[PDB]
Design a protein around this ligand. Structure first.
Ligand SMILES: C[S@+](CC[C@H](N)C(=O)[O-])C[C@H]1O[C@@H](n2cnc3c(N)ncnc32)[C@H](O)[C@@H]1O
Ligand SMILES: C[S@@+](CC[C@H](N)C(=O)[O-])C[C@H]1O[C@@H](n2cnc3c(N)ncnc32)[C@H](O)[C@@H]1O
Ligand code: SF4
Length: 434
């Protein structure tokens, strides 16, 4: 691999600014000013589908577990009204990207999937080669749902797996049929889905280096196009289902480090490039190519080739990134419904980024995605001299640089093989909010 693991250095950014900075004072006018800022810009769409069949005990997502399937019809009634009110604001735009996240998008049955896609296609102008993606829970679903997604124009999918280990599944209430997972992913491949991602989590109860290595051997026989391997974030005060997880079953910190180190080595051996953070992809993947070429980008869903898009987020909790602003819908379903009914939108809170916010966003995006930062381009675009504007930040950086996390000089910063896993540490030197 290109990372070089260093135990000792290892003892050392969703968006920027973060969601901590979103304010309820950000209202409808600020939103409309944001929408008018870049009328040319390609449009990306995000739709949040919050419903899940069953309560995964590890899960920290904005989601609603329910067997009352009719809630999905009520929710699409609300999405219809949101779409009908927001979409005319974007009549001149061309949509290059759509993703459904959640929650479980495939909670929607075939008729519901069709209904939503039809609302989107009739109210926004989609490019013929748009990237249309969805996340899929490989439980309580028939293989022919993939054919239906394909007929509806979906071309990318992500599938949660978490772990194949049966004890781990039982402890987190995510029992799943391994044969069916293989059937589902291989069927997706056979009908033309590409860039297929699977999610794995390390740090779950009862996982060890030896259990996770065995899981990864299977994953290699499954042969996904991309992998996302998340470190388990355990905060049972906030995520109530995690109270069902025994803290004593969680792996020790040395165990989690050994899981991660061995994972990176084994995925490299298996032909996957470590892109960054949670993500692995093949050397010829559009993401790996872009990264080499210095033009990898990132949004809330993750890495992407499509930069400089405005992102409109629809549905409960959905975040929009538009015209140098972030805006989020109501995160509780009952106030999402109530505001959509009364106003035709669910705008709750957000931020208009300052000049300084925008710069620093671009510094941080460059470091996170490309693992380097050329001063000169930032100096041109924003009419500044880097050393000055960032004197404070560079001072914070110095100790890190002497530790070999980054090589830095008068022209730029290079994140080293040793510093790649500590990228959040590096980016933190540029965060004014802390
Ligand atoms: C790759 S992330 C999952 C990682 C997870 N957030 C974590 O750190 O534990 C994708 C998920 O982020 C959320 N998401 C993505 N885009 C979003 C957006 N524009 N607004 C709100 N939520 C979004 C949805 O829950 C989606 O399924
Ligand atoms: C919206 S779910 C994926 C789609 C579908 N609902 C499923 O579970 O298959 C998004 C991903 O977030 C990750 N995730 C959720 N909670 C997490 C946590 N507390 N720590 C780390 N990753 C988490 C899981 O890998 C999960 O697949
Ligand atoms: S991991 Fe997925 S299926 Fe599970 S609760 Fe979270 S969002 Fe729902």
């Amino acid at each position: 691999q290109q990372i070089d693991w260093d135990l000792a250095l290892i003892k050392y950014y969703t968006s920027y600014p973060t969601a901590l900075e979103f304010s309820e004072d950000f209202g409808e006018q600020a939103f409309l000013q944001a929408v008018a800022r870049y009328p040319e810009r390609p449009l990306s769409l995000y739709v949040h589908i919050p419903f899940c069949h069953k309560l995964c005990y590890f899960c920290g997502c904005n989601k609603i577990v329910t067997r009352q399937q009719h809630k999905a019809d009520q929710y699409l009634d609300a999405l219809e009204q949101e779409i009908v009110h927001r979409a005319p604001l974007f009549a001149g735009r061309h949509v290059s990207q759509l993703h459904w996240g959640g929650g479980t998008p495939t909670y929607l049955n075939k008729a519901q999937i069709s209904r939503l896609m039809k609302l989107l296609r009739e109210n926004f102008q989609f490019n013929a080669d748009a990237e249309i993606s969805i996340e899929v829970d490989p439980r309580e679903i028939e293989l022919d749902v993939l054919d239906h997604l394909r007929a509806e124009g979906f071309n990318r999918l992500s599938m949660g797996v978490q772990d194949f280990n049966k004890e781990v599944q039982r402890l987190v209430n995510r029992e799943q049929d391994e044969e069916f997972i293989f059937a589902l992913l291989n069927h997706a491949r056979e009908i033309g889905f590409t860039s297929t991602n699977i999610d794995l989590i390390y740090g779950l109860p009862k996982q060890t280096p030896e259990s996770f290595a065995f899981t990864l051997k299977r994953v290699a026989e499954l042969n996904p196009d991309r992998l996302s391997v998340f470190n388990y974030a355990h905060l049972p005060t906030i995520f109530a289902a995690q109270r069902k997880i025994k803290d004593a079953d969680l792996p020790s910190p040395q165990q989690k480090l050994d899981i991660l180190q061995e994972t990176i080595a084994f995925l490299t051996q298996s032909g996957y490039q470590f892109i960054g953070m949670d993500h692995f992809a093949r050397p010829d993947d559009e993401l790996a190519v872009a990264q080499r070429e210095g033009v990898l980008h990132r949004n809330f869903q993750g890495y992407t080739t499509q930069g400089d898009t405005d992102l409109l987020g629809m549905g409960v909790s959905a975040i929009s990134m538009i015209g140098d602003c972030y805006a989020q819908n109501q995160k509780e379903l009952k106030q999402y419904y109530q505001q959509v009914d009364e106003q035709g939108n669910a705008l709750w809170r957000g931020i208009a980024l300052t000049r300084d916010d925008c710069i620093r966003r671009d510094v941080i995006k460059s470091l996170i995605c490309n693992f380097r930062l050329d001063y000169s381009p930032i100096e041109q675009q924003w009419d500044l001299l880097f050393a000055d504007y960032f004197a404070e930040d560079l001072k914070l950086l110095a100790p890190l640089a002497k530790d070999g996390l980054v090589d830095v000089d008068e022209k730029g910063i290079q994140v080293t093989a040793k510093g790649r896993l500590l990228i959040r540490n590096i980016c933190m030197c540029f965060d004014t909010y802390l």
